[PDB]
Amino acid sequence: SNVNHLIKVTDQSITEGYDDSDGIIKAHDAENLIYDVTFEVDDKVKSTMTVNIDKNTVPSDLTDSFIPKIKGEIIATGTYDNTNKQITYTTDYVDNIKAHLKLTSYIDKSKVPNNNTKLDVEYKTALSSVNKTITVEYQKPNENRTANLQSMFTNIDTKNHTVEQTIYINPLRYSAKETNVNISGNGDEGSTIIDDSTIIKVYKVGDNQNLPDSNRIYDYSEYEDVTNDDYAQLGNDVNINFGNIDSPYIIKVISKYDPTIQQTVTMQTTINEYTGEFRTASYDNT
């Protein structure tokens, strides 16, 4: 049964992942929240207790399928339930115990869509908890005249060796003529492999629709898939021809990598209809 009441918390903590950003979680830089807990297990405990991460967070950022346990001695095993951000630890071992858990967690973009979002995160252990206040700061779109875009890695499959990159195109809603986007796997720090195997989906943002600053889409279902391989021609890069556009578009890209991962997007636009003179904006992820 539930022994939450037999768990004696002796030390709790919410530590920011990076040391040059106190009070602020640079989510797009991948600043994680580390929950450190130390507690005493009463002897009456037999061969379950609970632990909760802040409602506005999740076990992993680049992975949707993500749960430690205490010990070579095995003190306990748990079960994660995202419906209520609650882990559940259940051994014959318990048959004076002390344990400490260091849990890492990330801002749940599906709930923190906008930037400069001030949140009062709290993590629970048994019947003890601890509070901290921080503000979630996301990224801004780069721009050069009518060119503008931004991108973010959104998922990583270590098994199959793949990464996902959600790109925003013309988010500020400019009238970009002759618009061209190029996704290159050849980077100044790492890389990715753009080939015939690379998957390119594309969606057009409605007039009523607003992209999420979290620069992450959870329900592509809602936007108009406008994917047409005819406009995607290979080049370690790939070019996409949008031409004259006035709306924001979404470019989801699944690609392969070497088993040092960087993907670079560039949006080019024609500033002089009579000349052919272009300007260019870029965004890379690492």
From Swiss-Prot:
GO terms for cellular component: extracellular region. GO terms for molecular function: metal ion binding. Keywords: Calcium, Cell wall, Metal-binding, Peptidoglycan-anchor, Repeat, Secreted, Signal, Virulence. The keyword Signal applies. It comes from the Bacteria. Disulfide bonds: none annotated. Its main location: secreted. Ca(2+) binds at residues 16, 21, 24, 31. It is found in: Secreted, Cell wall. One of its GO terms (biological process) is cell adhesion. Binds to the N-terminus of the B beta-chain of human fibrinogen and thereby interferes with thrombin cleavage and release of fibrinopeptide B, thus interfering with fibrin clot formation. This may hinder host defense against microbial infections. Belongs to the serine-aspartate repeat-containing protein (SDr) family. This is Serine-aspartate repeat-containing protein G. The lineage of its organism: Bacteria, Bacillati, Bacillota, Bacilli, Bacillales. The gene is sdrG. The chain holds residues 277 to 580 of 931 of the full protein.
